[PDB]
Structures are given as C-alpha cells and as structure tokens.
C-alpha cells in the first residue's frame, strides 16, 4: 500500500511501458481506475496492479 502525492491505494507496482507525456502525473484505465502513476521522486512510470 502506497502514497504518491496523497494518492493512496493498494497494489503491486511494476516497471511501466506507458509513455507518459511530461505534463501527465498518473494514468487511468478504460473504467477510470488508476492503473499507473509517476513516482514524484525519480519521475518513472509505475504500473499499479
């Protein structure tokens, strides 16, 4: 269970192949469920499963 900029949740993080644009901070699925997030420290994209 994690906390990115206050976005709290539970899941298993993984290296993401999603190419976030620079202004995008987190991702959302077909059903608006958050399924990716940019780590504010290292700025890498992490898939939330």
């Amino acid at each position: 269970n994690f906390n990115f900029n206050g976005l709290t949740g539970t899941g298993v993080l993984t290296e993401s192949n999603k190419k976030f644009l620079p202004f995008q901070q987190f991702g959302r699925d077909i059903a608006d469920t958050t399924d990716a997030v940019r780590d504010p420290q290292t700025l890498e994209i992490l898939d939330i499963t």
Binding site: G11, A31, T33, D35, T49
Partner: peptide
C-alpha cells in the same frame, strides 16, 4: 480487476465442446 470481480472458467473447455459436436456429427453421418 481492482473491483473485486472475477470471471470463472467454463467447466467444458472449447476443445471438449468441439469433441461433443464431432461425436454428434460422426454418429449422425
């Protein structure tokens, strides 16, 4: 997947249903 919902698998796989239809075809023919 996040939302506590699961899709269970059928008891008869598509290979088993295809065996039944081929058995019906072979018997009928």
């Amino acid at each position: 997947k996040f939302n506590g919902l699961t899709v269970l698998p059928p008891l008869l796989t598509d290979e088993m249903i295809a065996q039944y239809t081929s058995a019906l075809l072979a018997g009928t023919i």
